[PDB]
């Protein structure tokens, strides 16, 4: 379950 | 002499219903009532947001202020008969409400203890149709996080840029952004409105003037003023989340696509909700299976001429997007099986949705 | 060859929705599907009650039977497009459902494991309009107990006497009884129908033939048959609960009385809900107060010429009665402050309500 | 909180 490339946190 | 007013039930009902929303500590369950200069003001607060209503007084009245239990006062007024006149006065530590041969004596707390916002400072101001604010919020509200430790994601970004107002919401798995023209040249500003503030703003949208302050936002709608604290934190930049070159474009009818995902979802894993998409020339196949080894398969005609691809999604996140689009045809913009997809109305770029896939 | 049928969605939807109600153990979450002699039968059960629907098959079919997950099958059929044709066949340990380019493979359990009622034995039978059964149940359902250790009070008494059918419900604090003529000479019988059986019966009433068995009750409505187990126990005799000589009669408009109790209730104790009635010549005063020492007072014109009396009630129980009466004027029949009150429609004796007072 | 004269139980 990958995340969106939120910086930080993904 | 102390506060006294007499008002028709139907002039009080809707203001009371609205201020009774944003209401914990005893005085925070009360409304502040203030009579001055031919106007009754009613205020409700939870210490972070506030709703004020003004009601013109056309019958004789006496100035003053008190606080009274909000839900009780509203329920009393709502429960009186249509057309009733409601007389209010203060008697010691109580508020006496009279109408017909009905009498109610409510406990008060002093107006002087009621909270107030003391350092308000406005920085940008503009007006827009209520329906535009409602579209902006409805386009993105469902993608806000819920009780995320990253507090700033639990709200909604409001951003002014050029002549447009924009909302953004994300929870880390999906993102929604919507932009609308408002016909005024605006300074660039970005603020985060907390979840409960977004909800309250929606309750008011039944034109709108908005003021964005240093630490608060204020909305003026008719004889109501709503104020909310803003959230601290660095909200993510949606421009960096949108896929960079999503070359593979699929177009499909929104109803047929939504109905197919909804049927496939029935036989998806109840916890993980994964469905598999297989894209091929002018065709989409959706498959779902569950731990019971049940299987759903949907085949749809679509417009697509790219490479064949298989990609997995949480079907609930896909359906959330299709339900928020109000369009005849939907465009899905794809890159590969491990990169996010962008979804939009085929005939409008006002809103865009980004959903991360699940690994197969 | 195994079970196979093809049916229009709209011939399947409402039967499926209805049988999917009374559904724990895995096979109890399935519907039994049986094809025989031009008819598809669908059955749902929770081991104590059962709902069967029959659907005429106008397209070719093959006889057989299986059990399939009920909610999934219903949701699949509901989610297919209007006008869809639905083809069903068995493939190993699965049921294959096809419509258009949609395919669903559901897990089955063998029909031979599905429960059946084996000792049915009918003892009284009669027919009555659905609207009459609905009135009988709606008149008394709210007075059934909820999870009382006295299990027999959690259901509803159904009693035949003369040419009338009667329902009775009580929870020890209040009682409801309703009797309606059904135009047939009936044997005297009394049975207790469990709460969930009453609820299911109501779901069917959208004429009715009823059979009361030794240990079960059965209702036939159109192409549906509902069966419920009966409850053991001695239900109380409402004739012994009605006040014997409630000499003091008060009559009032139902709307005004209900609206006054509803307003007074706002300032009653949230736990005990007590209100005080003061009856005097052609007048009723209702008062409520709470631990905050707030106070409500309502004064109403009524018809009353008895002695003055003060009596306390749980306002929720009073409002429950007034809401169940569908009448212009209400009669309250009183004895003293520590004895129950009888409430009825001033213009009809079909139903009667008995409410115990609270001590002042 | 007296009960109706249910036998037994009141
Ligand atoms: Ca009036
Ligand atoms: Ca005084
Ligand atoms: Ca405040
Ligand atoms: Ca203020
Ligand atoms: Ca960023
Ligand atoms: Ca359309
Ligand atoms: Ca289009
Ligand atoms: Ca058809
Ligand atoms: Ca096979
Ligand atoms: Ca059974
Ligand atoms: Ca049977
Ligand atoms: Ca008895
Ligand atoms: Ca009427
Ligand atoms: Ca009447
Ligand atoms: Mg004052
Ligand atoms: Mg007073
Ligand atoms: Mg107070
Ligand atoms: Mg990538
Ligand atoms: Mg078979
Ligand atoms: Mg199969
Ligand atoms: Mg099964
Ligand atoms: Mg007595
Ligand atoms: Na005064
Ligand atoms: Na204020
Ligand atoms: Na008045
Ligand atoms: Na305003
Ligand atoms: Na799966
Ligand atoms: Na077969
Ligand atoms: Na059966
Ligand atoms: Na078919
Ligand atoms: Na039938
Ligand atoms: Na009280």
Author numbering:
A (entry chain B), D (entry chain B): 2 to 11
B (entry chain A), C (entry chain A): -1 to 21, 26 to 208, 213 to 366
Question: Can I see the authors' text?
Answer:
Although the co-crystal of msDnaN and MP A could not be obtained after intensive attempts, DnaN of E. coli (ecDnaN) was overproduced in E. coli and co-crystallized with MP A, GM and cyclohexyl-GM (CGM). Despite sharing only 29 % sequence identity with msDnaN, the binding pocket of ecDNA shows a sufficient degree of conservation. The binding pocket can be divided into a larger (subsite 1) and a smaller cavity (subsite 2) and as has been shown previously for GM and mycobacterial DnaN, all compounds occupy both subsites of the binding pocket.
The crystal structures were solved at resolutions of 2.12 Å (MP A), 1.65 Å (GM) and 1.50 Å (CGM). MP A was found to bind in the same mode to ecDnaN as GM or CGM. The comparison with the previously published mycobacterial GM/DnaN complexes shows that whereas the N-terminal parts of the ligands in subsite 2 superimpose very well, there is higher variance on the opposite side of the molecules around Pro8.
